[PDB]
Write a protein that binds this ligand. Structure first.
Ligand SMILES: Cn1cc(-c2ccnc3[nH]ccc23)c(-c2ccc(F)cc2)n1
Ligand SMILES: Cn1cc(-c2ccnc3[nH]ccc23)c(-c2ccc(F)cc2)n1
Length: 329
């Protein structure tokens, strides 16, 4: 189809005729997004242009990783792809990638204190998206208010210091963390929507861990005997020991079912944290939970993550992924 060129805040854009009325939303290191009208579907869409997708092996692999993940994500509460395109006619020319999805209004950071029913529906949608993501053996690792797209209907999709929502095993740089790092982030988000304050606004990674242990208590011997690192065990055992606080006391006034769920998500031992699938069955989501509409994902191959390839190999794989793309109906 026919492409049209255009400059927007220094960034150049080459998009098909079907996308009209471009309009910068925001930009940064990874790339610029534009809002647009999709003439073919009647939809407002976001169009993300990647910054220099094949600058290096790192960039080429990151580009491939993002396109593969977005092509796989097919769920009401995870961002997926309406379209992917390049203005290039062959592999030799290919140097730009554009990604298209349903325009969302605002982030969960912008919507902020919410009422208990709003908190139930937003955390329900996150957990339903995370059940799907985790079922593919994907770990988000970066769940925070800014990575949650919400529209005026309170419909939520998974896409402010990052450390504030990070599980304590990532503060001390554990290399074998599991998917419940994401449940820790959900617990921190749910706290912040109930209270109107960051649960653990650490000034750095050391302060961040001290605020966490202040609420959840320093580890018992059951957790300490799973810490392989001698420096980390020495450090954690050398802190002044604080007990697990009563969550009923800290979240005074909240739904006791919200409090119970928070206790199940912010357990220090990652092996004892509630899973996304378990959390959806919790009494706090009785108004919203439906076990025949909480779907899992098709299996997801990320063996490419263990491969060391040339820039042009990552580039051609990415090109291959643009060409095989089938739009949703
Ligand atoms: C950081 N970031 C936000 C958006 C985004 C998505 C939907 N609605 C939005 N409204 C304002 C930004 C935004 C994207 C994006 C755009 C297109 C894609 F295909 C994939 C991701 N990245
Ligand atoms: C290196 N490392 C692993 C863990 C860890 C955390 C949670 N669950 C786990 N299961 C097996 C190891 C492990 C921690 C840690 C524990 C307590 C803290 F207060 C701060 C960090 N450090």
């Amino acid at each position: 189809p026919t492409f049209y060129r255009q400059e927007l805040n220094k960034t150049i854009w080459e998009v098909p005729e079907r996308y009209q009325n471009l309009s910068p939303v925001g930009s940064g290191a990874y790339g610029s997004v534009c809002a647009a009208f999709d003439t073919k579907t009647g939809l407002r869409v976001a169009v993300k242009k990647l910054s220099r997708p094949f600058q290096s092996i790192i960039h080429a692999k990151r580009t491939y990783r993002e396109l593969r993940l977005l092509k796989h994500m097919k769920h009401e509460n995870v961002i997926g792809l309406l379209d992917v395109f390049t203005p290039a006619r062959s592999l030799e020319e290919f140097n730009d990638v554009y990604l298209v999805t349903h325009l969302m209004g605002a982030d969960l950071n912008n919507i902020v204190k919410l009422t208990d029913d709003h908190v139930q529906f937003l955390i329900y949608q996150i957990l339903r998206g995370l059940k799907y993501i985790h079922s593919a053996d994907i770990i988000h690792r970066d769940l925070k208010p800014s990575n949650l797209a919400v529209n005026e209907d309170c419909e939520l999709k998974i896409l402010v210091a990052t450390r504030w929502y990070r599980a304590p095993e990532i503060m001390l740089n554990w290399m074998h963390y599991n998917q419940t790092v994401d449940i820790w982030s959900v617990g921190c988000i749910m706290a912040e929507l109930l209270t109107g304050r960051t649960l653990f606004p650490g000034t750095d990674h050391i302060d961040q861990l001290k605020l966490i242990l202040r609420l959840v208590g320093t580890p018992g011997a059951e957790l300490l005997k799973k810490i392989s690192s001698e420096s980390a065990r020495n450090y954690i055992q050398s802190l002044t020991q604080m007990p697990k606080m009563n969550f009923a006391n800290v979240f005074i006034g909240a739904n006791p079912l919200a409090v119970d769920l928070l206790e199940k998500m912010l357990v220090l031992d990652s092996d004892k944290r509630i899973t996304a699938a378990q959390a959806l069955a919790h009494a706090y989501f009785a108004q919203y939970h439906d076990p025949d509409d909480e779907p899992v994902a098709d299996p997801y191959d990320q063996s490419f993550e263990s491969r060391d390839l040339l820039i042009d190999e990552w580039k051609s794989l990415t090109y291959d992924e643009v060409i095989s793309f089938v739009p949703p109906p």
